[PDB]
Amino acid sequence: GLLKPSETLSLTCAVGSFTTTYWNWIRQPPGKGLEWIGEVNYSGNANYNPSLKGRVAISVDSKNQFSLRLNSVTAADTAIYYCTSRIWKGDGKGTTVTVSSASTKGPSVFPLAPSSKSTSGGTAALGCLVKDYFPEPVTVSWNSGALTSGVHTFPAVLQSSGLYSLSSVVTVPSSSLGTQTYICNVNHKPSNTKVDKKVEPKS
């Protein structure tokens, strides 16, 4: 799942016409394109991508499986890893891999509210800032799921500290900021952190 920098990434996938079968590893970093890692025939002849200057090792083993071994990992190696075969290619799923020097931490939840009072008739925006958590998976709802319209929960960003930050907003009519309550429902299962945050503007 997750591991620290300078450690060794090791994965294995299960396993036809072995003499003409090629086994490939590819990966996709978060929000980026697809990247080819290496290919291998049944004998053991090896080909890899130049960017991985020898830190990559792919071999097929007895057990019906083939492996991937990335040496001296970095935060740049954080990606979802896929393994495929080829005669015509093909093998979803995949394995999420996060390389980080951070520890598991629950998020702080802060209110997102306007500086000044809202003008009636128009639309008002409000929300929750879910800051400084690790690892990635955090979920947000509003009013226990009763409020879905106008809700925008944004993709998390990776801060320089190594911790993630996410914003969740909602736009509501201004003439209801006094008749309706708004609470963001934040759940970070990796740290068992559940927070209920009521956000209230004036008027």
Binding site: E39, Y82, K89, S108, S115, F154
Partner: protein, 214 residues
């Protein structure tokens, strides 16, 4: 190696129309070992085409690939709402195997200017020694938008992070969130905090601001 450039990069169409995606290789691809992958947000890449022309199982005959040498093409006839996604071209002919940068097939709609909101940092957070100022750009199209942070008219650079939502399933718009991060001291040392937004749907840039301490 063989670099691959895809075009248009961003294709904006509507359901029922015809989509044509292009993949150009720097050098020729002899055995036509060309593959096309479809990928929706949060999902694994699904193999759509292999051998440049052979359609994979799971995809209707609306999808077809053709081409040879250095030019390859993916065609999607009679576009359906589930066809709009990211598309990658791939060559597995000459080592090292490479990928195209991708083409985003999005739903085209009328131009919509963003609704801009600004949020000051909370007292809660200010008690911790860090200040986050947030700017929201709500429901705009197209996706391209620019945010400039100003603190007492000083242009901020390298201290903000943005993220954008996927195209909305209802109104086909995008939303953007930007966060300016400052220390509490620096935050208290200044008064006017402004988010300035530029977008092709805006007649002129829209600035939302506030004064620390009102």
């Amino acid at each position: 190696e063989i670099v691959m450039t895809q075009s248009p990069g961003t294709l904006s169409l509507s359901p029922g129309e015809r989509a044509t995606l292009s993949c150009r290789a720097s050098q020729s691809v002899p055995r036509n070992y060309i593959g096309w992958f479809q990928q929706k947000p949060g999902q694994a890449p699904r193999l759509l085409i292999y051998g440049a022309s052979s359609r994979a199982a799971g995809f209707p005959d609306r999808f077809s690939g053709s081409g040879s040498g250095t030019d390859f093409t993916l065609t999607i006839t009679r576009l359906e709402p589930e066809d709009f996604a990211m598309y990658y071209c791939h060559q597995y002919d000459r080592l090292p195997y490479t990928f195209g940068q991708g083409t985003k097939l999005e739903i085209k709609r009328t131009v919509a200017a963003p609704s801009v909101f600004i949020f000051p940092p909370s007292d809660e957070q200010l008690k911790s020694g860090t200040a986050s100022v947030v700017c929201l750009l709500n429901n705009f199209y197209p996706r391209e938008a620019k945010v400039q942070w100003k603190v007492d008219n000083a242009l901020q650079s390298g201290n903000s992070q943005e993220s954008v939502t996927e195209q909305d399933s209802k109104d086909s718009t995008y939303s953007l969130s930007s966060t300016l991060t400052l220390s509490k001291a620096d935050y208290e040392k200044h008064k006017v905090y402004a988010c300035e937004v530029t977008h092709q749907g805006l007649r002129s840039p829209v600035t939302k601001s506030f004064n620390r301490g009102e």
